[PDB]
Amino acid sequence: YKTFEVVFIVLVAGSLSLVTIIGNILVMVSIKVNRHLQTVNNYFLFSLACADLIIGVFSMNLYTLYTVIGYWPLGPVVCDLWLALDYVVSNASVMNLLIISFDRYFCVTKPLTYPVKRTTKMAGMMIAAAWVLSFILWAPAILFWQFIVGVRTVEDGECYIQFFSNAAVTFGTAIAAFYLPVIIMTVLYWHISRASKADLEDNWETLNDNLKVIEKADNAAQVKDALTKMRAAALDAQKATPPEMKDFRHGFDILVGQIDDALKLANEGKVKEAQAAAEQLKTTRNAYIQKYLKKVTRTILAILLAFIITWAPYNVMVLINTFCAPCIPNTVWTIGYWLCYINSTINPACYALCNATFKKTFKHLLMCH
Numbered sequence: 001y002k003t004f005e006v007v008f009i010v011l012v013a014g015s016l017s018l019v020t021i022i023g024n025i026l027v028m029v030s031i032k033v034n035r036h037l038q039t040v041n042n043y044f045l046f047s048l049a050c051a052d053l054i055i056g057v058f059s060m061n062l063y064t065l066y067t068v069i070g071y072w073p074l075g076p077v078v079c080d081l082w083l084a085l086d087y088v089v090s091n092a093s094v095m096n097l098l099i100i101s102f103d104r105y106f107c108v109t110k111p112l113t114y115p116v117k118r119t120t121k122m123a124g125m126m127i128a129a130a131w132v133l134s135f136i137l138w139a140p141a142i143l144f145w146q147f148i149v150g151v152r153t154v155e156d157g158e159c160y161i162q163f164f165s166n167a168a169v170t171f172g173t174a175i176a177a178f179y180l181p182v183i184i185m186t187v188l189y190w191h192i193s194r195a196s197k198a199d200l201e202d203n204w205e206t207l208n209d210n211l212k213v214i215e216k217a218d219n220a221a222q223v224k225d226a227l228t229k230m231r232a233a234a235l236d237a238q239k240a241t242p243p244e245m246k247d248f249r250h251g252f253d254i255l256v257g258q259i260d261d262a263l264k265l266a267n268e269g270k271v272k273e274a275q276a277a278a279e280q281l282k283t284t285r286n287a288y289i290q291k292y293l294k295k296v297t298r299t300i301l302a303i304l305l306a307f308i309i310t311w312a313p314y315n316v317m318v319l320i321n322t323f324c325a326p327c328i329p330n331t332v333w334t335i336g337y338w339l340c341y342i343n344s345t346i347n348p349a350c351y352a353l354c355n356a357t358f359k360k361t362f363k364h365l366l367m368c369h
């Protein structure tokens with residue numbers, strides 16, 4: 001079965017690399033070719049997509065060659081450049097997640113001061129500072145530690161970080177570069193989720209949700225559920241208010257008067273007309289939303305959970321490796337490493353495949369024009 005496993009591993013690894021490259025390239029190009037996708041969040045996600053792209057192109061393929069061949073074939077220089085590369089990139093991705101978490105935390109805790117300084121140049125300076133800090137932290141030690149000590153203990157055919165020859169050093173690295181950032185992002189997400197936990201915002205949110213659910217509906221029950229719940233939220237949104245009060249009160253009545261005419265068509269047997277009243281509900285909605293004036297936290301939690309779940313096994317393998325070396329076979333190390341790579345694979349699916357503008361931009365990129 002070992003001969004079969006070589007082929008299966010090559011196919012699975014190459015497939016994962018290709019999916020990573022295609023996804024992150026789609027994200028980056030989508031952000032660059034669409035101005036509507038040019039915000040601070042999409043700048044942070046742009047840098048994250050760049051790091052995941054570098055992991056998909058260089059790290060996955062070189063590690064696949066390393067494990068499949070059984071030893072390092074490219075030499076010591078390419079080994080040091082590879083280790084420094086994926087280590088710097090991974091560090092920059094971690095501090096990028098920290099940047100996103102602190103950015104959202106300051107958005108929810110300082111609404112009257114932070115958003116005015118939240119511009120494009122500031123986000124670019126933060127990203128550049130993250131990449132430079134990662135390079136300074138990891139590149140000189142990995143590349144030049146052998147010259148600092150005066151001897152290269154990495155024999156021919158091997159490829160590993162030299163100063164990681166001691167287990168406690170690797171464990172301290174795991175604590176400083178993973179566990180503490182994970183705890184920081186967990187506390188920050190805790191305060192953000194407790195901050196989102198105002199009423200009329202949730203009412204109108206429910207309205208624009210179910211109103212599009214009517215259009216996306218495949219069968220008949222979805223239009224009735226979205227209708228009824230949207231109308232409970234519509235009346236509860238009518239009683240709440242931020243003579244303009246008579247017009248505010250006269251948006252929901254002219255809304256409901258036709259709403260019951262739509263639900264009347266929802267129970268008659270022909271749902272195509274009931275769904276055809278949606279655009280009219282919208283052109284009536286515009287007059288109210290003119291005088292009227294979370295998904296982001298969901299995305300953040302998705303990315304954070306992807307990072308933690310994909311990077312936890314390797315780090316617990318380090319913690320166990322401190323006091324027991326035979327407790328972790330080589331295959332297990334390969335599995336954990338590859339999961340840490342899988343983070344970059346599943347990263348674009350946590351924000352790109354859940355945003356409508358990203359969907360339309362993807363469709364626009366994969367079509368004729």
Ligand SMILES: C[N+]1(C)[C@@H]2C[C@@H](OC(=O)[C@H](CO)c3ccccc3)C[C@H]1[C@@H]1O[C@@H]12
Pocket residue numbers: 059086087088090091094173174175177178311314315318337340341
């Ligand atoms: C590419 N990896 C698979 C390598 C091994 C792991 O290293 C870590 O988990 C440590 C913290 O234990 C780490 C090092 C640098 C940056 C972030 C984490 C995951 C990533 C990271 O670039 C290395």
